[PDB]
Amino acid sequence: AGRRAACGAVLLTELLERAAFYGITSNLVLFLNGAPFCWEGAQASEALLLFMGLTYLGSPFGGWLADARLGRARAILLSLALYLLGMLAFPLLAAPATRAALCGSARLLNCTAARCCSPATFAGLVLVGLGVATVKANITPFGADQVKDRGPEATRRFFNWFYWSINLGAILSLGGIAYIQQNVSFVTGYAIPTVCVGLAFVVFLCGQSVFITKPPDGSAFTDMFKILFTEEKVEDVKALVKIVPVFLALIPYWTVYFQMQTTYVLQSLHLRIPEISNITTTPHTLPAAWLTMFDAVLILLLIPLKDKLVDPILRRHGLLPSSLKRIAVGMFFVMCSAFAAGILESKRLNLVKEKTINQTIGNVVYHAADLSLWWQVPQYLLIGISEIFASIAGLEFAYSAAPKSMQSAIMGLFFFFSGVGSFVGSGLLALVSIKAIGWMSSHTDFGNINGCYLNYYFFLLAAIQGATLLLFLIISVKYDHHRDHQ
Amino acid sequence: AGRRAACGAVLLTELLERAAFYGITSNLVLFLNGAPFCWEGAQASEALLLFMGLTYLGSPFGGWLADARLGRARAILLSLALYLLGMLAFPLLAAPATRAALCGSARLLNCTAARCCSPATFAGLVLVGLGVATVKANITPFGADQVKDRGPEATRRFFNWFYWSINLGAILSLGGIAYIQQNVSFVTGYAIPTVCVGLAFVVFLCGQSVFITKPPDGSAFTDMFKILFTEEKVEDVKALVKIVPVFLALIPYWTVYFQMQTTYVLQSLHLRIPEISNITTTPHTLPAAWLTMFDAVLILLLIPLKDKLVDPILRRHGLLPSSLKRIAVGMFFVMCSAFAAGILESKRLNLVKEKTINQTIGNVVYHAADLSLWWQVPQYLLIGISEIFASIAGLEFAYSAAPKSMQSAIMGLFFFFSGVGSFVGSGLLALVSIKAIGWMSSHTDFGNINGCYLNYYFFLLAAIQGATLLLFLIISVKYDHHRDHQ
Numbered sequence: 001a002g003r004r005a006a007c008g009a010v011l012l013t014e015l016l017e018r019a020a021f022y023g024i025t026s027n028l029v030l031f032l033n034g035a036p037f038c039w040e041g042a043q044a045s046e047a048l049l050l051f052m053g054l055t056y057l058g059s060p061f062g063g064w065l066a067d068a069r070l071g072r073a074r075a076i077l078l079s080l081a082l083y084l085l086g087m088l089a090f091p092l093l094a095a096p097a098t099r100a101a102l103c104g105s106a107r108l109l110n111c112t113a114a115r116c117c118s119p120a121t122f123a124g125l126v127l128v129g130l131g132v133a134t135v136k137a138n139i140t141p142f143g144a145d146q147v148k149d150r151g152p153e154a155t156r157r158f159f160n161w162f163y164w165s166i167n168l169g170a171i172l173s174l175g176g177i178a179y180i181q182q183n184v185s186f187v188t189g190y191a192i193p194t195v196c197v198g199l200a201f202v203v204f205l206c207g208q209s210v211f212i213t214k215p216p217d218g219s220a221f222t223d224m225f226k227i228l229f230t231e232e233k234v235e236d237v238k239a240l241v242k243i244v245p246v247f248l249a250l251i252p253y254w255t256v257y258f259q260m261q262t263t264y265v266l267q268s269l270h271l272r273i274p275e276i277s278n279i280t281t282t283p284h285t286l287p288a289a290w291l292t293m294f295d296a297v298l299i300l301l302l303i304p305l306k307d308k309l310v311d312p313i314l315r316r317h318g319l320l321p322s323s324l325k326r327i328a329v330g331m332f333f334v335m336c337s338a339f340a341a342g343i344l345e346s347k348r349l350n351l352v353k354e355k356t357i358n359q360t361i362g363n364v365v366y367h368a369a370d371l372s373l374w375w376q377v378p379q380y381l382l383i384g385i386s387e388i389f390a391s392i393a394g395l396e397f398a399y400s401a402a403p404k405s406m407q408s409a410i411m412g413l414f415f416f417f418s419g420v421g422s423f424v425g426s427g428l429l430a431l432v433s434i435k436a437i438g439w440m441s442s443h444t445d446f447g448n449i450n451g452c453y454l455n456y457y458f459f460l461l462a463a464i465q466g467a468t469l470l471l472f473l474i475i476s477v478k479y480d481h482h483r484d485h486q
Numbered sequence: 487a488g489r490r491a492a493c494g495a496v497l498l499t500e501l502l503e504r505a506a507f508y509g510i511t512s513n514l515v516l517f518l519n520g521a522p523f524c525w526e527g528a529q530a531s532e533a534l535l536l537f538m539g540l541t542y543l544g545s546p547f548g549g550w551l552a553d554a555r556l557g558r559a560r561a562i563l564l565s566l567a568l569y570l571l572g573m574l575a576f577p578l579l580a581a582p583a584t585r586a587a588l589c590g591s592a593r594l595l596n597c598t599a600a601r602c603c604s605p606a607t608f609a610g611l612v613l614v615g616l617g618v619a620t621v622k623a624n625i626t627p628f629g630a631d632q633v634k635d636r637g638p639e640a641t642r643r644f645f646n647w648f649y650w651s652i653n654l655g656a657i658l659s660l661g662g663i664a665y666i667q668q669n670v671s672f673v674t675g676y677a678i679p680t681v682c683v684g685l686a687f688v689v690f691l692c693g694q695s696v697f698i699t700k701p702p703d704g705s706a707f708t709d710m711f712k713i714l715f716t717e718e719k720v721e722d723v724k725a726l727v728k729i730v731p732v733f734l735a736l737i738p739y740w741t742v743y744f745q746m747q748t749t750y751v752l753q754s755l756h757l758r759i760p761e762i763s764n765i766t767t768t769p770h771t772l773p774a775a776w777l778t779m780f781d782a783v784l785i786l787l788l789i790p791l792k793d794k795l796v797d798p799i800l801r802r803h804g805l806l807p808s809s810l811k812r813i814a815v816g817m818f819f820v821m822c823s824a825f826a827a828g829i830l831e832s833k834r835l836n837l838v839k840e841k842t843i844n845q846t847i848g849n850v851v852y853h854a855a856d857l858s859l860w861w862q863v864p865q866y867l868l869i870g871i872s873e874i875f876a877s878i879a880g881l882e883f884a885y886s887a888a889p890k891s892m893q894s895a896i897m898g899l900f901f902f903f904s905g906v907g908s909f910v911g912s913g914l915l916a917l918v919s920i921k922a923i924g925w926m927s928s929h930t931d932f933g934n935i936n937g938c939y940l941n942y943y944f945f946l947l948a949a950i951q952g953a954t955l956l957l958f959l960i961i962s963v964k965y966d967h968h969r970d971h972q
């Protein structure tokens with residue numbers, strides 16, 4: 001022990017940061033379709049798409065800022081400051097007293113009659129995305145540096161609870177904050193994540209007195225020679241060009257898991273959801289963020305079992321000693337869950353032809369089938385086993401396979417390739433929606449999937465995941481042969 | 487080279503042996519339901535079940551005979567002699583001139599009116615099964631001993647063409663011999679496999695002059711001490727008790743692949759099969775052995791591609807150096823094929839509700855769907871990739887992981903555990919047919935599956951295969967750690 005405070009402070013900072021981030025993405029589309037904006041669905045979705053795109057693209061640049069110029073701690077503080085500065089825009093816009101201060105004074109109430117307060121919300125989204133980008137690429141290596149002098153097992157044990165805190169903040173946001181934004185006063189609904197950001201900044205500032213920081217290395221990126229003589233700078237390029245194919249093969253894995261995360265909630269919208277006695281009935285409604293947290297809850301339950309039972313057994317039996325093998329196991333569980341979801345959708349698509357029941361979730365009617373929502377339990381347990389096997393392993397791999405000088409930059413490139421996979425998954429979803437292929441071609445997301453073929457999409461995702469699993473297993477052997485052999 | 491004749495003779499012997507064996511099992515049920523016997527379907531199926539059971543149970547005993555008493559070459563010759571002696575019973579029974587010599591003189595022609603010539607056919611089946619049992623357990627180690635002094639790569643290359651010859655004899659039997667037994671004169675239909683057995687015996691006798699044999703070791707099994715001091719006899723037990731869990735975990739793999747081999751042909755019976763111009767039309771009919779060889783043809787096509795392209799690349803890239811990893815890859819392909827077959831059956835079960843077409847294969851009407859048989863091409867290509875990855879690897883593993891003194895016995899135990907898996911698969915098929923579970927509960931095999939749920943059975947087989955794949959991958963690491971480390 002001894003360094004328990006330096007880890008707890010980073011865990012709390014990441015928890016609050018993820019809570020605020022999943023608060024801004026849980027009801028942003030519904031907020032843009034409201035009194036102050038009255039935007040259309042296309043632009044409302046494009047706003048969140050550009051937000052996540054800036055978050056993914058900005059992430060590497062945040063690592064370069066934390067490595068070449070700043071010390072990866074002042075970088076986190078500055079990024080959290082820019083994050084908090086952009087967080088006030090949403091409560092200031094939702095408040096009628098300050099909506100006049102932001103831009104004009106929004107008159108449109110029933111959306112009877114092209115964007116209002118566009119620069120304000122766009123600057124807020126840009127600053128929030130850049131803040132999340134610079135934080136996520138610098139919070140995992142700086143957090144793992146607190147226990148780096150104890151061995152890789154300490155970093156893995158820390159990353160376990162790091163992921164656990166990320167999906168306890170996500171549950172606290174999607175469960176509590178989103179329900180507040182959906183049914184009760186909205187100004188406080190957006191003010192709570194801002195308070196979370198402020199508390200995270202304060203916690204990091206107080207924890208700076210016990211953190212073990214590293215001085216910046218400015219003359220590290222200028223020595224990326226590409227024409228072929230100081231030493232220890234050649235190895236930083238040899239250890240960098242060898243980890244690129246791993247991320248390239250992980251891109252389609254991100255594609256499959258992001259499309260699965262979207263389509264799983266989309267399918268959960270079309271199942272029989274039980275009514276909470278007096279929480280989702282009149283005059284309130286059930287938020288969709290709970291259907292989204294249906295998999296963070298399982299992860300939160302699962303992680304303590306892996307850290308206490310699975311990891312010691314696998315360590316004392318010599319099973320899965322490297323992170324790449326755990327990533328392969330996670331991808332196998334991902335394709336298994338995709339096949340299970342395809343089976344469940346094939347069974348569900350036969351029930352909607354006979355009888356459909358109407359349910360209201362997002363103040364909209366969904367024609368669900370006569371099938372309990374708890375039938376998604378196996379398909380969610382499988383992705384729960386996969387993320388605790390693939391995501392934590394990928395994080396500790398990006399932390400360990402990176403050079404000592406370039407860590408935040410490599411983590412930012414990891415998140416950027418994850419975002420590239422997400423965009424490839426969006427393009428794949430748009431590809432199967434053409435007139436040639438009738439799979440998922442009724443309308444855009446959050447609609448009616450009774451006329452679509454989601455089981456075929458799940459089977460295609462499973463086949464793709466299996467192919468990229470074989471590819472990753474092929475390239476994993478070619479990479480582990482240079483870790484302790486060459 | 488230099489030893490090309492000693493390998494070609496064993497390949498031809500195995501080819502003819504497998505051809506005769508797959509000739510006796512292609513139309514045995516239809517033969518027992520005919521003029522000389524007029525048996526019922528239950529006893530006709532029980533006869534083949536007991537035949538295969540004696541084949542599987544007898545296999546280890548054949549290895550003990552080839553190791554403790556005989557020299558594994560005289561054992562093969564004696565087993566082939568007993569095989570040929572039991573092969574004459576079927577042509578002698580089918581011939582009207584000798585049917586009176588066998589037992590009485592069978593009068594029942596239209597089966598108007600409890601077994602006729604029961605001792606004759608039972609003794610023939612018993613002797614043929616014991617012959618196949620003693621041959622299969624002694625033909626692979628004796629055949630692999632011709633190239634054992636060149637390295638494991640030579641044994642793997644030999645086993646490739648060994649499997650290729652096994653499924654070229656199977657095609658020559660199911661394609662040519664079964665079509666002769668189905669439409670044209672039946673006496674010659676059963677006399678052809680007997681000629682094949684005689685030719686195999688003659689070929690082995692002529693090739694005995696170039697085979698490299700091993701003297702028998704009688705004092706090898708008496709030293710299986712189980713209470714706990716000559717050396718090299720303790721290692722023979724340590725290398726024997728360690729390979730038992732591998733076979734125990736391979737048992738459910740055999741269960742899944744035997745049930746798949748049965749249900750794949752059963753599903754192929756319910757698809758649109760094109761008519762050969764003047765081969766399957768009046769007055770002839772399409773044999774089911776061709777629908778069964780639909781996967782041996784693909785294997786025959788695939789094997790030369792693996793021996794010439796896949797193996798050199800995997801060798802020069804350090805990929806899959808052990809047989810257990812290839813077995814795991816084969817099991818992964820098996821579960822992938824099971825999922826694909828489940829998808830295809832889910833698509834097929836929706837077409838039979840609208841329109842069904844009638845087709846005659848075994849002189850019986852099948853209500854097939856309006857779906858081409860060539861849609862089974864992916865599900866058969868996957869099992870083709872699996873067998874060339876799992877079966878050859880399992881054979882070379884049973885040959886290499888066995889002690890030098892006990893090889894045929896270990897191969898016989900391998901085939902016995904395969905048969906145990908087959909019987910477990912039969913019990914599993916009988917388990918899902920209870921009144922509680924409506925999966926495959928219309929009737930016995932070779933019937934109507936339009937009222938059954940074969941897609942659910944395929945999904946269950948896929949889940950079981952994945953579970954046993956994870957188990958095998960877990961136990962594979964615990965076994966490879968004592969090959970070159972301990």
Ligand SMILES: CC(C)C[C@H](NC(=O)[C@@H](N)CCCC[NH3+])C(=O)O
Nearest residue numbers: 166167170292293295296299391418
């Ligand atoms: C791999 C990264 C990009 C994703 C990771 N996701 C989670 O932690 C989820 N378990 C949270 C669930 C909320 C929506 N389904 C992350 O948070 O960074």
Ligand SMILES: CC(C)C[C@H](NC(=O)[C@@H](N)CCCC[NH3+])C(=O)O
Nearest residue numbers: 652653656778779781782785877904
């Ligand atoms: C693993 C052993 C027991 C099976 C093996 N099977 C084959 O070779 C098939 N490819 C033959 C196909 C004919 C019926 N589908 C064997 O022959 O021993």
